[PDB]
């Protein structure tokens, strides 16, 4: 319930945010507080905020 996948590319503008490519997977560390979620990239190992509207849950969308 914490494994999510990027639907689009994203270039971070704040240093607290992750950049990512479409198809990149994440473990969500916190679903907020707000519309950006704290996540760890399973590609890079880095942690940061990602916009929640750019990701979808992996297990249910196959």
């Amino acid at each position: 319930v914490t494994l999510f996948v990027a639907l689009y590319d994203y270039n971070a503008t704040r240093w607290t945010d992750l950049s990512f490519h479409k198809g990149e997977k994440f473990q969500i560390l916190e679903f907020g507080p707000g519309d950006w979620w704290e996540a760890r990239s399973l590609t890079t190992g880095e942690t940061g905020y990602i916009p929640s509207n750019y990701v979808a849950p992996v297990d249910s969308i196959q």
Binding site: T2, N11, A12, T13, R14, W15, T16, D17, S19, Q27, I28, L29, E30, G32, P33, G34, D35, W36, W37, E38, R40, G45, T47, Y49
Partner: protein, 221 residues
Amino acid sequence: IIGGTECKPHSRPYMAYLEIVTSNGPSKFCGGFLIRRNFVLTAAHCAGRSITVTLGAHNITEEEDTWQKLEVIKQFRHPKYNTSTLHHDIMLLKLKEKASLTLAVGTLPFPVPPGRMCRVAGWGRTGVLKPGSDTLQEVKLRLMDPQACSHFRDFDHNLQLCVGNPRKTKSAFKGDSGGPLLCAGVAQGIVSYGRSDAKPPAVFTRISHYRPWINQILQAN
């Protein structure tokens, strides 16, 4: 800290190094500062599952007799913190035990016009593509008019300070979050966020706004 210099060891005795255990994977790190024997101030975005604070450090990879390494028992993240805007990026950490006040470990006193020179310290990256620093670094930065932060969509001058002359490369950066901005020897700001490319200014939480909230937490705990 980009564009700064290594601190004289133990010359900034309020500085705290935070190691934060996350829900998944390895820990993250942040700065912070001791404000009471059992309270550390930092940024809200440094929260996690559990936090260990190291006080008395210079080189964070070299244990010394000055170290006091303490577990956090309670995280008091500002209740209006929001990840979209990063407003209210402030958190108080209650330590499991009180720190011993020594020459190497102490509290930072509290009491600000644009144009004045301030200082910030941390273990963060020393350039955009550089690793964090093992040693505590510090840099002198100019407090800017809020207009200098106009490109930050969610900047709010009542809540935040705009810090760092944009014509220089000097700045706080990744890993420095939570550290204090000192102007004339007293805490005025907390490192919050800035551009991914490290071009100043960066955005700092304006401590003065949060004094009532801090005081209520301190009085109750």
